[PDB]
Amino acid sequence: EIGRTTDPVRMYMREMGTVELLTREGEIDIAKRIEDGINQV
DNA sequence: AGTAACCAATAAATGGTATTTAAAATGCAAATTATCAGGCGTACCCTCTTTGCGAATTCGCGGCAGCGG
Numbered sequence: 001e002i003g004r005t006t007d008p009v010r011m012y013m014r015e016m017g018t019v020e021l022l023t024r025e026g027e028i029d030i031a032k033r034i035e036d037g038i039n040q041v
Numbered sequence: 042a043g044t045a046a047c048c049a050a051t052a053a054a055t056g057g058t059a060t061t062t063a064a065a066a067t068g069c070a071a072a073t074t075a076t077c078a079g080g081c082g083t084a085c086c087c088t089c090t091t092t093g094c095g096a097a098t099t100c101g102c103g104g105c106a107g108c109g110g
Contacts (some may be wrong), residue, residue: 013089
């Protein structure tokens with residue numbers, strides 16, 4: 001479908017649109033996993 | 042109201058060759074103050090959205106393209 005949109009801004013927004021937000025639970029989940037990795041090392 | 046240029050003489054006529062004198066002044070490189078230029082950090086919560094709107098009704102020409110026997 002790509003209409004050869006050479007505009008880099010369009011490519012950036014198209015790439016970033018895929019990943020979806022998640023709040024109040026993930027942040028805690030990922031922070032815990034980061035601290036766990038650091039504690040392991 | 043007194044002739045000399047006679048021959049010695051006198052040092053003054055210069056402008057030229059230098060190791061000095063130390064005082065100055067003139068530069069020189071430190072110490073020692075001001076001020077400028079970087080780095081870091083900030084805990085309520087905030088989540089694609091802004092754009093260009095059109096190097097702006099050109100036009101004529103060419104040719105490298107996709108569809109098609």
